[PDB]
Amino acid sequence: DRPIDDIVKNLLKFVVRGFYGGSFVLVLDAILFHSVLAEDDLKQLLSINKTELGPLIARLRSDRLISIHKQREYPPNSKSVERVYYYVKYPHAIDAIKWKVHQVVQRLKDDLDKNSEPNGYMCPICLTKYTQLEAVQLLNFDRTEFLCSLCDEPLVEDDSGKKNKEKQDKLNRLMDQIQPIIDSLKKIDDSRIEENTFEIALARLIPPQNQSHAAYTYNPKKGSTMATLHINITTASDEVAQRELQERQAEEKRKQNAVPEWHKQSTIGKTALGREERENEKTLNDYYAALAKKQALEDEFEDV
Amino acid sequence: PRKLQDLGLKPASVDPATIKRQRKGKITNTHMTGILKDYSHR
Amino acid sequence: LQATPASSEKMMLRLIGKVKPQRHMFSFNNRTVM
Amino acid sequence: QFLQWCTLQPENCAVFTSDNKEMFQTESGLVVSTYSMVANTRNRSHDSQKVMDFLTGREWGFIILDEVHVVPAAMFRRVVSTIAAHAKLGLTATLVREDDKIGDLNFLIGPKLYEANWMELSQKGHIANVQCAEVWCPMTAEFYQEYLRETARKRMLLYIMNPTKFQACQFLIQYHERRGDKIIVFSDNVYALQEYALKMGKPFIYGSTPQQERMNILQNFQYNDQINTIFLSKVGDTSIDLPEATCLIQISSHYGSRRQEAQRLGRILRAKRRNDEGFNAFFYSLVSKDTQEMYYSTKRQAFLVDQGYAFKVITHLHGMENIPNLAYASPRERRELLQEVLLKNHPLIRKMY
Ligand SMILES: [Zn+2]
């Protein structure tokens, strides 16, 4: 349909295979395939349990991936239940992915920044960290070792700083795995994103099964403060009919706009007011043929 | 949206909803009532 | 060919045929679809 | 008109009426008001008192006295003296009065500036081509027999209700309704318009009709093509908003009041079918023969023939002999109408009472 819809679907698929497990992949693929889904339809499609979808729905709600709709409809048996509907907001989802990847790369860049700091010291008895600044004030009279304040034991060197190359390798090994996401967000920013909702995502629905208990028709509430082309073809034989119609309409409007008889005429002298060639052409055709031979549920309805 | 703009990354979303957003009277022609059709517009 | 107005919450489409006409019901989900 | 045709802001325009008294705060602006805003000597509101003090205390450079023929009235003469304005323009369409005070408007306003040629504007498609007519209704024998011994107000009450004018008006409505002509029928007497409207089943608008009815029936006459005939009172003679009509019928009249006829004719003169070629608007003055109608109507048409319009006299209608519906054809119905016109003329003890 929309190529931008395909781009955001591919982006959501890539991030759910990347930073999520298989069941999250199944849930997001069900949402991107069937655009509007409910809880019972998801249970029918995925054979998932409530205690199993609980972590799934909680995680995709915490990660801001699936928009949930709180709508209760009235079934004909009057057993109305609060059914939940799962759809996706594309601009909110791409902004969430943008913010998450930006904070990921910011956190890992800060890790690479802080791992350039020297090793520091650490007391194995008290298991308390020490930076480079306070190691000097723990120096003994022998001017060699750094004695702990509480344990009175020489400090050992923490293994931080030699992993700076490991953090750089982690940073590069993260970033070569995120470049398709970078390209997808570049293509999104080069285009326009239409902000949808439940009423708009219902336009591209795919039915999960034949019989779904949750209806897909929105019920409005009052007081909540949260054309045709028709042609006419003439065979060059009926034009006289509508030209006769035109001239009779012209004389009709002339008569309707005509001066009345008592205006144009004097009413004084009149009384006071009070209370066969078929055989010929057949023989002609016979003669010409001989000459050629010689020569050779009820509700309101409107019509449309 | 606005802290994306503050961070220099242009947003692809419209600002959300949390952002500040918006007699009868008598008749005298009773002899032919039900014929006069209501004209609330031209 | 019969349609429901957009103001009506009941959403129905009906088709009238020609020769006992055959009448078929078409309930939809989205209004732009109709 | 100021808000539409000229570049005047609504903050520069103001209204002095009963409901509206707020004015422009700018140093110079504009206000539109009624004549009896200024010239009323009655005990008024403090707001209107302050307003007229402001109007007196403001020096005006121009006043537009619309419908200037009522200015020579006793209160309305004083508005050019109370309101000190440099230039006074008297705009009207009917510069005629029954009394001689219409000549005093030279002292009130000034010399007569421009006279518009009615026939010149009619021929070039600016005002409508009206066909002024005078329908002669012969007075019936019983009605005239009772008419010759009656007092004057009852004389009008008798000759307005002859059946020949009933038949003539019925036929004119029937014929011009078939022509697609909007018709406004003027009759000043309330009893006359009510009797005709109940006879023919037509809408009627007299003085004490509710205003919302005078709007609903107005829009039905304007737009609903089923209704093409409205019977209208002296209220329609003055400035009230009415739809466009091409035929007018005058049943009764307020004496020979030479202002009223041109006020009535100006309603038909605004006809929208003017630009169509062959269009002819119609005017009818239905008069009762051998009664005071010709005296009054000759006074009425003296002004119009001074302007140049020609009232073609009509003494016979082609269609009486073959009319489908007949009003007062029988002598018994006419006699019944005759006798109908003859018979026409302490906090606890408060709950105690
Ligand atoms: Zn220690």
Side-chain angles (χ1 to χ4, degrees):
Chain A
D1 313 336
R2 184 186 183 190
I4 318 297
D5 282 357
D6 301 331
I7 297 302
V8 300
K9 278 179 180 182
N10 291 326
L11 165 66
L12 259 66
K13 282 176 183 177
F14 206 108
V15 301
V16 72
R17 280 102 173 103
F19 309 104
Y20 298 92
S23 301
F24 314 94
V25 164
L26 292 180
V27 170
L28 193 43
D29 198 2
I31 294 304
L32 297 161
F33 192 53
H34 307 270
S35 301
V36 174
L37 281 174
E39 193 260 357
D40 48 354
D41 305 334
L42 192 59
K43 284 190 306 170
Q44 212 280 331
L45 285 184
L46 260 63
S47 80
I48 202 76
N49 305 343
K50 286 99 168 181
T51 187
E52 296 173 0
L53 62 84
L56 300 176
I57 298 308
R59 279 291 324 281
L60 281 72
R61 186 71 264 179
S62 179
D63 290 319
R64 192 215 276 263
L65 281 176
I66 296 306
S67 183
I68 49 179
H69 200 270
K70 302 316 152 202
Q71 183 186 161
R72 161 142 46 95
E73 53 265 14
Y74 313 105
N77 45 25
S78 302
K79 288 296 296 297
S80 299
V81 293
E82 182 38 61
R83 291 157 187 162
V84 292
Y85 294 89
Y86 299 92
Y87 69 101
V88 62
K89 303 268 297 300
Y90 286 149
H92 283 244
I94 66 187
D95 284 13
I97 293 310
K98 199 175 186 179
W99 276 108
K100 286 206 83 169
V101 72
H102 176 70
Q103 292 172 22
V104 163
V105 303
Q106 277 296 320
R107 204 72 41 82
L108 188 58
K109 280 168 59 57
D110 293 6
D111 205 310
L112 192 71
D113 290 330
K114 66 102 176 178
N115 213 4
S116 62
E117 192 263 325
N119 288 87
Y121 290 90
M122 192 304 297
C123 185
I125 301 186
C126 66
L127 294 175
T128 56
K129 294 291 183 178
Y130 293 91
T131 73
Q132 206 71 268
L133 265 295
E134 65 268 19
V136 181
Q137 62 186 17
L138 299 191
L139 183 147
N140 46 4
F141 183 75
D142 291 331
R143 319 294 177 185
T144 306
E145 305 93 356
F146 300 146
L147 272 297
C148 171
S149 302
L150 184 55
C151 310
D152 293 329
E153 198 262 328
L155 264 52
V156 310
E157 170 182 346
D158 184 61
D159 43 356
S160 185
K162 301 176 181 57
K163 309 170 61 62
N164 192 28
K165 190 180 179 179
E166 306 176 6
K167 294 303 176 181
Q168 188 179 17
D169 293 328
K170 277 163 51 59
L171 182 59
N172 300 346
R173 277 185 284 103
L174 185 149
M175 294 182 287
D176 54 347
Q177 297 174 352
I178 196 66
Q179 193 68 32
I181 307 303
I182 299 182
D183 293 331
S184 58
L185 275 296
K186 284 288 291 295
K187 289 185 298 182
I188 288 308
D189 199 18
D190 289 332
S191 65
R192 189 62 259 178
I193 293 290
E194 167 191 0
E195 181 147 78
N196 58 333
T197 175
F198 188 75
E199 318 291 329
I200 303 301
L202 272 166
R204 53 183 76 89
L205 73 165
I206 305 294
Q209 71 260 11
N210 259 324
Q211 296 89 7
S212 64
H213 293 317
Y216 297 96
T217 305
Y218 174 69
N219 296 291
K221 49 186 61 57
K222 190 66 62 182
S224 57
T225 51
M226 281 325 108
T228 185
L229 282 180
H230 291 265
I231 73 165
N232 299 126
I233 301 187
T234 318
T235 65
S237 62
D238 305 328
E239 298 283 339
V240 290
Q242 70 274 16
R243 82 150 180 254
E244 198 269 332
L245 291 174
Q246 286 164 352
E247 62 91 20
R248 65 96 178 170
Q249 183 48 63
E251 68 95 19
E252 204 272 338
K253 78 173 61 65
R254 276 318 306 134
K255 290 292 182 182
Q256 201 62 260
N257 301 328
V259 193
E261 53 182 353
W262 50 82
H263 290 84
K264 61 177 183 177
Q265 296 177 355
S266 179
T267 64
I268 302 183
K270 308 172 185 177
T271 178
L273 59 87
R275 47 174 296 191
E276 199 65 37
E277 57 93 20
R278 303 306 180 184
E279 59 88 20
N280 193 12
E281 60 93 15
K282 279 307 171 186
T283 54
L284 190 150
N285 190 25
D286 289 326
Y287 186 84
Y288 272 85
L291 188 153
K293 185 254 290 180
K294 179 183 176 59
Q295 189 175 2
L297 290 201
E298 303 307 309
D299 52 349
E300 53 268 13
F301 288 138
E302 291 97 4
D303 294 338
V304 65
Chain B
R2 85 287 188 277
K3 68 174 305 177
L4 261 186
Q5 292 161 354
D6 291 331
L7 261 66
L9 301 93
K10 62 183 78 67
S13 182
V14 192
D15 50 341
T18 305
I19 298 287
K20 171 187 70 172
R21 279 183 177 270
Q22 299 296 321
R23 260 79 180 192
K24 191 255 290 181
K26 57 183 301 296
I27 193 66
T28 62
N29 306 52
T30 50
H31 62 283
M32 60 79 71
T33 184
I35 297 169
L36 296 178
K37 65 178 72 66
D38 186 282
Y39 284 154
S40 64
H41 62 87
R42 301 166 294 182
Chain C
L1 293 169
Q2 292 325 296
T4 46
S7 64
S8 72
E9 181 65 28
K10 184 67 181 70
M11 172 145 178
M12 191 36 49
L13 278 297
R14 202 186 190 93
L15 182 139
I16 301 301
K18 78 164 63 62
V19 179
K20 300 180 299 299
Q22 278 78 16
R23 300 172 301 274
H24 306 255
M25 61 80 71
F26 293 99
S27 167
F28 287 93
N29 308 280
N30 217 58
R31 279 83 65 194
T32 77
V33 177
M34 314 164 299
Chain D
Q1 300 310 292
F2 291 103
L3 291 188
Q4 172 185 342
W5 291 352
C6 76
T7 68
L8 190 69
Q9 282 79 13
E11 51 93 17
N12 291 338
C13 185
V15 175
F16 192 25
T17 45
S18 59
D19 48 351
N20 196 287
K21 288 191 189 64
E22 70 273 14
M23 311 296 208
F24 55 93
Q25 287 311 316
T26 177
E27 72 274 13
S28 299
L30 191 142
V31 64
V32 297
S33 66
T34 313
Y35 277 109
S36 53
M37 293 296 103
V38 178
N40 200 1
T41 54
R42 217 180 82 93
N43 298 124
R44 52 175 78 258
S45 65
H46 200 277
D47 195 2
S48 55
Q49 183 55 256
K50 179 171 298 301
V51 169
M52 62 80 71
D53 289 330
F54 163 69
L55 300 185
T56 309
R58 165 70 68 87
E59 173 184 331
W60 307 94
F62 193 29
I63 176 172
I64 312 187
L65 301 101
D66 188 72
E67 302 293 330
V68 71
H69 64 266
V70 305
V71 184
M75 43 193 169
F76 293 162
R77 160 187 328 260
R78 319 192 270 96
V79 299
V80 299
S81 68
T82 57
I83 308 166
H86 291 264
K88 311 177 275 301
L89 167 65
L91 288 172
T92 189
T94 59
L95 199 58
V96 63
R97 293 178 64 88
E98 297 301 312
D99 51 352
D100 62 358
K101 294 203 278 308
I102 197 78
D104 300 64
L105 278 171
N106 55 8
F107 316 128
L108 300 178
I109 314 287
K112 183 67 177 67
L113 304 183
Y114 183 81
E115 275 284 334
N117 190 13
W118 329 101
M119 311 325 147
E120 192 181 4
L121 301 189
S122 74
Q123 61 86 30
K124 69 178 69 175
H126 282 142
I127 70 189
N129 291 318
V130 291
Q131 303 290 336
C132 302
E134 178 172 333
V135 181
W136 294 69
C137 310
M139 182 36 88
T140 61
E142 293 94 1
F143 268 77
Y144 202 67
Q145 191 268 346
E146 303 259 26
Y147 169 89
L148 265 293
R149 281 84 66 193
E150 211 172 13
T151 183
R153 311 306 303 270
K154 261 289 200 165
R155 293 283 275 272
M156 283 74 75
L157 199 60
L158 202 47
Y159 64 85
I160 289 163
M161 293 297 102
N162 62 6
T164 46
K165 199 180 294 181
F166 262 72
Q167 293 166 354
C169 176
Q170 184 182 55
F171 178 74
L172 281 181
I173 288 304
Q174 184 167 334
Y175 185 80
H176 284 256
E177 185 177 1
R178 296 196 306 255
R179 302 186 79 259
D181 292 334
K182 293 300 186 173
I183 312 166
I184 300 181
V185 178
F186 272 106
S187 49
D188 293 333
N189 194 2
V190 167
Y191 187 44
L193 61 91
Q194 289 190 16
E195 272 288 340
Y196 268 83
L198 288 202
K199 187 60 175 181
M200 293 177 70
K202 301 292 189 302
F204 60 99
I205 297 296
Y206 70 109
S208 75
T209 46
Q211 194 269 335
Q212 65 183 177
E213 200 173 16
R214 301 181 285 215
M215 295 298 102
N216 169 48
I217 287 184
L218 189 87
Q219 263 80 66
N220 290 135
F221 173 78
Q222 188 161 14
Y223 302 113
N224 176 36
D225 274 28
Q226 192 268 329
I227 293 301
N228 313 280
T229 287
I230 174 65
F231 285 81
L232 190 52
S233 183
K234 200 157 77 88
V235 190
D237 301 337
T238 179
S239 186
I240 60 171
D241 196 2
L242 306 167
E244 298 305 330
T246 56
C247 167
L248 192 151
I249 300 172
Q250 187 161 181
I251 300 306
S252 66
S253 71
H254 193 31
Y255 309 132
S257 64
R258 304 185 305 265
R259 187 265 302 165
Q260 187 182 6
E261 297 84 4
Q263 276 208 279
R264 267 152 168 185
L265 191 83
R267 309 285 85 81
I268 316 296
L269 284 171
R270 301 201 178 183
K272 299 287 99 176
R273 206 170 66 241
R274 187 184 300 114
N275 298 117
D276 191 0
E277 185 64 30
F279 157 74
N280 273 292
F282 297 101
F283 186 85
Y284 297 93
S285 178
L286 262 68
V287 287
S288 295
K289 201 182 183 182
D290 294 330
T291 71
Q292 201 73 252
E293 293 269 9
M294 283 73 74
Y295 184 57
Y296 279 145
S297 74
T298 305
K299 295 195 289 188
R300 292 186 79 79
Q301 299 149 7
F303 186 69
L304 276 296
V305 304
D306 291 331
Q307 314 317 128
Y309 290 116
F311 274 82
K312 197 184 67 67
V313 291
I314 302 181
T315 188
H316 169 52
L317 291 177
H318 301 110
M320 295 298 103
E321 312 96 354
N322 305 323
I323 187 73
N325 61 6
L326 307 100
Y328 302 123
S330 195
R332 59 89 174 173
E333 216 178 1
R334 282 181 263 109
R335 189 183 65 249
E336 188 261 0
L337 170 68
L338 177 55
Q339 286 71 241
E340 153 165 49
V341 175
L342 288 187
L343 188 153
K344 173 65 172 59
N345 282 314
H346 44 279
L348 181 70
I349 49 180
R350 51 98 177 169
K351 312 197 303 174
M352 202 165 188
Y353 46 86

